[PDB]
């Protein structure tokens, strides 16, 4: 069972961006679905839930209410939705699959983000 | 009671080894842990 | 009145409870017949509880609001296997209901174990208390417990064609919230099959 | 296997609710006086070094689980290397009792030197933790200087515990905690 | 340890039954704050059971019924209710007595299992367990607070230093 | 000769038979282990026979022909279920293998029951006969029957990642028609479990 | 002697069949547990090597003997030739363990040092051969870390054997092998 | 193990009765498959019966009778049954039993014997074993698979690591 | 049981230096070796 990000690229502060990820192998509305971000240098930090049933979501505080997460059980995929972005968001953003509150294990190779200012 | 492997007696007399322990006038947990409730608290059926 | 409810390796705890309904007997009748030559045999892994949704009840819902349940049901553990394994089974239901408000709600519920259930008039739902039953009155319990043998008119009976029990839950009195209460009360089930027996191995599909 | 959670007796339900069986337990490994008697590293200072348990870190295996427990007693084990001649100092001796080879010194055998030494502390029973951050003079089994100490090892002889405390672990980011584990 | 710190998990109206859900380990990060998983990180392999407490918090106008269960490793834990019945399970509701307590078996291959979790372990070995909201009477916005603490049969060996 | 075996409801019989093969034990060791809490049971209803085809033996097949064959298999009766309801078994195998010529066939064949089978060297068949076996000597049995207990370094094994036992069909001397004989010879397999127990019911898939 | 092959039953034939006497056995040196137990050498690796009997040579006396068994149990002792402080730590314990003092830590003592470990993993027997090329990272009895360490022993102890497999001897070309055998 | 590289011997139909013919050693390259011979690598010395086990695999219609024999040391050993017929040896022939077994004696002047065959030895010290083919009736083409295992007496000693 | 010299009790308990064995509730192959069949399978002549 294998994720992976997209919609990682460089923006200025203020903007957007989507991030995306597949899921491979397995059911995928069977799963939590999470994301994780490594800001550089420091250790990796959560961010953002959705339950199976995309009812459940929970939000980093730093990140809450900025950013928006979707998935989409049809299409095989999650969606976080950056709004406002600051310059301290910039981190690679790992995808995580899985059943723990925290999402946890299965995790993709993570996208790189860079907003600039 | 500790890590220790002599079949044999120590050496050293036990009032040098150690420290003699004085007398005045798992004890507590233990004694509480067998003290659980394992039972059922309402009737059994089946 | 705490009640504790062991079936397998599964239980069920209720702290309001009005006791257990025994219907038509106490225990099953004899196993062994003379129509299985003595190939029958029991299943002990399959005796277990399993949950079920019924459905939201409402104060719109009148008097005469029912719900039919049969058994057996679709069922995706080791119960629902055997009736794809086996020609023959047969089995004893310990069913339990559970509709949760708070002690503020009101109005009752009916629910039974109606054996060879079609079509049951409306006025004859008025005589529904002949069979085993337990009323729910929030008032009092939150929880309805039946064990019931297994009836029919053969031994050993094929669930493909003939469900033996119905299970029916009924609304004698409408909800009233009083403010106090919950809003609607949901119903679920908790059901297990008892005594199982099983004869008659089909092949496979390969 | 319903009851009251207020009343904080404890409850213990087991397997034959629904149908199991209860086999049986050998708990040496977690007995107190087993598992708390091993040495374990402390840093040294060059020349005096008080004796003390609570210099072990905390996240160490005999560091943590010493913590745990507000009142603890047992005797002390060292193994010390060190160069020149290690003087040993009895509880609340003045400090410029070191200096004194009529005091307990074990002249310099290498690699390094062992000494077994008693409960020497004025106190009935020692703390971890005392409520008066600091910890009072008097929690000590004394202290031992040499020319230079390069390591210092404490280990617990008949050790005691008493009124549990929290012991807590790392706590995941993940939903589980992964570590490498040995494998072949 | 609950999300947003609290150790206790609410009830919810919604489609969605599952009240808590995490692996059966003792370097969970749930577990993380339980003295029973304080030990743990000390020694290398237990045996035996564990014992859940749940104490339901909410006022005396409010009912639910709940439902823990335990999902055994090589398929995915339940999502559903209806789709736990099958596993081992208990069940019960809120009442006079306000504590109710849960036995986790010890079920497995070896006759004992690591404490700590390798990384090279994707899929929990111990399985998970479930904790289920069936329904409640008006008890939006009430808590149930869990507790842990070792069974009659827990047993823990083989005393190792891994820092932490 | 004659030898009749009896599993469940099901049944072989042999004419001619050089009797049974009890491998490594004659009776299963310890069931009930403190791993799993006395929550195992043992399933009556999954032991009997089921059949498989092996291979085509033929005069081409040099010395040195050998058929690996993992157990437990595919298996779309009672047994296959067990391995998706439950997540950890055991059990014993009881193995019977049937290839028939005509006694005027000759060669040789060697069957055994081999535990924890991994790319056994060539050279290494010379010694296979340290396992328990049975040679199957058209010029005087027809089949080999073998019976194996469970061994694992665990008490229950998890099927899915592991496989214990595999059975193996070497040929020690090529076949010959010389005329009168069968011109090839059809090997098929008869196997059971035994004493098999089952813990830990997995969920449903709905 | 005649009987049918087929049958597998064990037949041994004796001497006295054409008029011998069979004489009297004394096997003490293939007994298991007799021959298994001596050190036999392991390559080792510079810092940490996880104690494995499988990486005993496959050629070694005690290497090949081990391998003719499915399910083999022992304990183990170790000899080891190493700079700097030798540290034990058991089984499935993480890798960040084998820095701490507290874990069982030999202090470098020439030539070398010897000690003797239980047998500390969570089956109730290990295994040569597995299926599911891998072992499973469960079999092991721990690793061992040093500054370096320059050689490595395994010995067993109490060495138990089951279910065997072949054991094979080196293929002659000609019709006999032929070794140069001391000579005086 | 035989040529071909098949643990077998075919019958065969000329003025040639030989039908295997091989050293007595636990070096030699026909045994060098066994198990038996597996052991002995490990162990410098041996006393003790060897036995072998035939098994005739042809069809019901064809009937062989066959010849072991053992030759000692310091001569020859024979390449005709006739002048095996002074040696130790037996014979038997294919019937409703399809199996035989021989046991090979332990004889020597030294109470043990080496496993190893020295480099500087010419002729085996052991002498050799010899198996003929006495007739066949329409045994054409039909194979006579041999096995090996230790005796009752077998005893093996000093155990040597000799790499191999 | 294996290669050990000392006449003399070990120095340490039988707990330390050995792991200790648990019970529950040359075996196999020697069983199987005794039962070998010895004799002639038809009847002796002379």
Same mark, same amino acid.
């Given at each position: 069972?294998?994720?992976?990000?997209?919609?990682?690229?460089?923006?200025?502060?203020?903007?957007?961006?989507?991030?995306?990820?597949?899921?491979?192998?397995?059911?995928?509305?069977?799963?939590?679905?999470?994301?994780?971000?490594?800001?550089?240098?420091?250790?990796?930090?959560?961010?953002?839930?959705?339950?199976?049933?995309?009812?459940?979501?929970?939000?980093?505080?730093?990140?809450?209410?900025?950013?928006?997460?979707?998935?989409?059980?049809?299409?095989?995929?999650?969606?976080?939705?950056?709004?406002?972005?600051?310059?301290?968001?910039?981190?690679?953003?790992?995808?995580?699959?899985?059943?723990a509150?925290p999402?946890?294990?299965?995790?993709?190779?993570?996208?790189?983000?860079?907003?600039?200012? | 009671?500790?890590?220790?492997?002599?079949?044999?007696? $120590?050496?050293?007399?036990?009032?040098?080894?150690? !420290?003699?322990?004085?007398? +005045?006038? $798992?004890?507590?947990?233990?004694?509480?842990?067998? !003290?659980?409730?394992?039972? +059922?608290?309402?009737?059994?059926?089946? | 009145?705490?009640?504790?409810?062991?079936?397998?390796?599964?239980?069920?705890?209720?702290?309001?409870?009005?006791?257990?309904?025994?219907?038509?007997?106490?225990?099953?009748?004899?196993?062994?017949?003379?129509?299985?030559?003595?190939?029958?045999?029991?299943?002990?892994?399959?005796?277990?509880?399993?949950?079920?949704?019924?459905?939201?009840?409402?104060?719109?819902?009148?008097?005469?609001?029912?719900?039919?349940?049969?058994?057996?049901?679709?069922?995706?553990?080791?119960?629902?296997?055997?009736?794809?394994?086996?020609?023959?089974?047969?089995?004893?239901?310990?069913?339990?209901?559970?509709?949760?408000?708070?002690?503020?709600?009101?109005?009752?519920?009916?629910?039974?174990?109606?054996?060879?259930?079609?079509?049951?008039?409306?006025?004859?739902?008025?005589?529904?208390?002949?069979?085993?039953?337990?009323?729910?009155?929030?008032?009092?319990?939150?929880?309805?417990?039946?064990?019931?043998?297994?009836?029919?008119?053969?031994?050993?009976?094929?669930?493909?064609?003939?469900?033996?029990?119905?299970?029916?839950?009924?609304?004698?009195?409408?909800?009233?919230?009083?403010?106090?209460?919950?809003?609607?009360?949901?119903?679920?089930?908790?059901?297990?099959?008892?005594?199982?027996?099983?004869?008659?191995?089909?092949?496979?599909?390969? | 296997?319903?009851?009251?959670?207020?009343?904080?007796?404890?409850?213990?339900?087991?397997?034959?609710?629904?149908?199991?069986?209860?086999?049986?337990?050998?708990?040496?490994?977690?007995?107190?006086?087993?598992?708390?008697?091993?040495?374990?590293?402390?840093?040294?200072?060059?020349?005096?070094?008080?004796?003390?348990?609570?210099?072990?870190?905390?996240?160490?295996?005999?560091?943590?689980?010493?913590?745990?427990?507000?009142?603890?007693?047992?005797?002390?084990?060292?193994?010390?290397?060190?160069?020149?001649?290690?003087?040993?100092?009895?509880?609340?001796?003045?400090?410029?009792?070191?200096?004194?080879?009529?005091?307990?010194?074990?002249?310099?055998?290498?690699?390094?030197?062992?000494?077994?030494?008693?409960?020497?502390?004025?106190?009935?029973?020692?703390?971890?933790?005392?409520?008066?951050?600091?910890?009072?003079?008097?929690?000590?089994?004394?202290?031992?200087?040499?020319?230079?100490?390069?390591?210092?090892?404490?280990?617990?002889?008949?050790?005691?515990?008493?009124?549990?405390?929290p012991l807590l672990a790392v706590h995941p980011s993940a939903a589980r905690h992964?570590?490498?584990?040995?494998?072949? | 340890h609950f999300?947003?710190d609290?150790p206790?998990?609410?009830?919810?109206?919604?489609?969605?039954?599952?009240?808590?859900?995490f692996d059966?380990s003792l370097a969970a990060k749930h577990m993380s704050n339980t003295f029973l998983a304080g030990?743990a990180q000390?020694?290398?392999?237990?045996?035996?059971?564990?014992?859940?407490?749940?104490?339901?918090?909410?006022?005396?106008?409010?009912?639910?019924?709940?439902?823990?269960?335990?999902?055994?490793?090589?398929?995915?834990?339940?999502?559903?209710?209806?789709?736990?019945?099958?596993?081992?399970?208990?069940?019960?509701?809120?009442?006079?007595?306000?504590?109710?307590?849960?036995?986790?078996?010890?079920?497995?291959?070896?006759?004992?299992?690591?404490?700590?979790s390798?990384?090279?372990?994707?899929?929990?070995?111990?399985?998970?367990?479930?904790?289920?909201?069936?329904?409640?009477?008006?008890?939006?916005?009430?808590?149930?607070?869990?507790?842990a603490?070792?069974?009659?049969?827990?047993?823990?060996?083989?005393?190792?230093?891994?820092?932490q």
């Amino acid at each position: 069972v294998q994720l992976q990000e997209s919609g990682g690229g460089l923006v200025q502060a203020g903007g957007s961006l989507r991030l995306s990820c597949a899921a491979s192998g397995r059911t995928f509305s069977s799963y939590a679905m999470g994301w994780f971000r490594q800001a550089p240098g420091s250790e990796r930090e959560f961010v953002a839930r959705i339950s199976w049933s995309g009812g459940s979501t929970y939000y980093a505080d730093s990140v809450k209410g900025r950013f928006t997460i979707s998935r989409d059980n049809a299409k095989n995929t999650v969606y976080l939705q950056m709004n406002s972005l600051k310059p301290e968001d910039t981190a690679v953003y790992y995808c995580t699959a899985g059943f723990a509150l925290p999402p946890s294990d299965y995790w993709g190779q993570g996208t790189q983000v860079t907003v600039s200012s | 009671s500790g890590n220790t492997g002599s079949i044999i007696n $120590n050496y050293y007399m036990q009032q040098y080894q150690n !420290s003699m322990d004085t007398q +005045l006038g $798992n004890d507590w947990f233990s004694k509480l842990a067998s !003290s659980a409730f394992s039972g +059922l608290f309402g009737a059994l059926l089946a | 009145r705490i009640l504790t409810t062991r079936n397998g390796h599964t239980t069920s705890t209720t702290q309001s409870s009005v006791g257990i309904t025994h219907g038509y007997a106490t225990a099953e009748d004899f196993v062994n017949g003379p129509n299985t030559s003595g190939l029958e045999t029991r299943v002990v892994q399959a005796e277990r509880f399993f949950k079920t949704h019924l459905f939201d009840w409402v104060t719109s819902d009148p008097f005469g609001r029912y719900y039919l349940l049969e058994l057996p049901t679709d069922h995706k553990g080791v119960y629902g296997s055997l009736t794809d394994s086996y020609a023959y089974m047969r089995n004893g239901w310990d069913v339990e209901v559970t509709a949760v408000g708070n002690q503020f709600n009101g109005g009752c519920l009916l629910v039974a174990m109606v054996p060879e259930l079609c079509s049951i008039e409306q006025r004859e739902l008025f005589q529904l208390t002949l069979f085993p039953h337990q009323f729910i009155n929030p008032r009092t319990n939150m929880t309805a417990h039946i064990k019931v043998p297994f009836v029919g008119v053969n031994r050993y009976d094929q669930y493909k064609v003939h469900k033996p029990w119905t299970l029916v839950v009924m609304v004698v009195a409408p909800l009233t919230v009083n403010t106090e209460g919950a809003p609607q009360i949901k119903v679920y089930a908790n059901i297990a099959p008892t005594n199982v027996h099983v004869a008659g191995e089909f092949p496979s599909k390969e | 296997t319903t009851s009251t959670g207020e009343s904080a007796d404890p409850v213990t339900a087991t397997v034959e609710n629904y149908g199991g069986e209860t086999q049986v337990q050998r708990r040496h490994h977690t007995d107190v006086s087993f598992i708390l008697d091993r040495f374990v590293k402390v840093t040294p200072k060059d020349s005096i070094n008080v004796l003390d348990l609570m210099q072990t870190p905390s996240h160490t295996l005999v560091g943590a689980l010493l913590r745990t427990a507000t009142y603890y007693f047992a005797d002390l084990e060292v193994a010390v290397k060190h160069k020149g001649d290690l003087t040993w100092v009895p509880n609340g001796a003045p400090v410029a009792a070191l200096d004194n080879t009529t005091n307990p010194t074990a002249y310099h055998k290498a690699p390094l030197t062992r000494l077994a030494l008693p409960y020497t502390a004025p106190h009935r029973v020692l703390a971890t933790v005392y409520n008066g951050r600091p910890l009072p003079t008097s929690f000590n089994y004394g202290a031992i200087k040499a020319t230079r100490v390069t390591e210092l090892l404490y280990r617990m002889k008949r050790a005691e515990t008493y009124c549990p405390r929290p012991l807590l672990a790392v706590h995941p980011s993940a939903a589980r905690h992964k570590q490498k584990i040995v494998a072949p | 340890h609950f999300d947003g710190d609290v150790p206790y998990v609410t009830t919810k109206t919604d489609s969605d039954r599952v009240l808590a859900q995490f692996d059966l380990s003792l370097a969970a990060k749930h577990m993380s704050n339980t003295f029973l998983a304080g030990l743990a990180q000390y020694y290398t392999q237990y045996s035996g059971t564990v014992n859940l407490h749940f104490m339901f918090t909410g006022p005396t106008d409010a009912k639910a019924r709940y439902m823990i269960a335990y999902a055994p490793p090589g398929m995915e834990p339940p999502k559903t209710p209806e789709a736990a019945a099958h596993c081992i399970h208990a069940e019960w509701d809120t009442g006079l007595n306000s504590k109710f307590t849960f036995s986790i078996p010890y079920l497995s291959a070896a006759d004992y299992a690591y404490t700590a979790s390798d990384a090279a372990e994707t899929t929990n070995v111990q399985g998970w367990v479930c904790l289920f909201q069936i329904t409640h009477g008006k008890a939006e916005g009430d808590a149930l607070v869990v507790l842990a603490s070792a069974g009659k049969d827990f047993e823990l060996r083989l005393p190792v230093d891994a820092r932490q």
